[PDB]
Design a protein around this ligand. Sequence first.
Ligand code: 8CR
Length: 208
Amino acid sequence: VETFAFQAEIAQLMSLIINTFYSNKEIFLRELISNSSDALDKIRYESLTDPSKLDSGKELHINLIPNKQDRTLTIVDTGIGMTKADLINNLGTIAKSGTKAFMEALQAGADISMIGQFGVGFYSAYLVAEKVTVITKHNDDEQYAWESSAGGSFTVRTDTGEPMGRGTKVILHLKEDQTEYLEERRIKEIVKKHSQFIGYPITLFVEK
Ligand SMILES: COc1ccc(-c2c(-c3cc(Cl)c(O)cc3O)noc2NC(=O)C(C)(C)C)cc1
């Protein structure tokens, strides 16, 4: 397991998200579904010029999986996935500029719900999760697990869990007071409100 420091700007963003009083936490789900949709758009487009990129799975979809025993909400997609370089280096570089712009916008009167306009909507996960685990598999790279409970660091390891084929699984370990996001009625409500027109099937699993 390798441990990395977030760039200072991203650590600062995460602290703001965790510390700021902001009741409209539900927007985290829209932001993660948006990311899934973007990743799905990417594999779809790439597959038009190289159909073999779908050898790792033809189905393009999003599953939402609540688990009350584990207190997790998992968002699974079959998008393009992220490479080790994406996880450690590339996406952080991009997130640095988006974060700066978002911070400045907040000072100017924007609110946390606008985070996705700055390309860093993922971090809104920390409105509801104490720990986020991201399992991801891109063609031509290995399956990795990224993980962070904030506090300025994240880890990456090669994942020896169940093989995903291709795509990304975001496992939200929910804060004790945010279990409403495990309720079918609540998730359905949020998806209808904010993600009604996403161009891939979203299946909300129910609990046993
Ligand atoms: C907004 O920035 C991103 C959105 C989605 C993804 C993504 C994701 C992804 C990321 C997150 Cl955080 C998520 O919640 C869902 C995803 O499918 N999986 O593969 C992905 N692959 C990439 O898009 C490229 C172009 C970099 C290879 C990465 C960055």
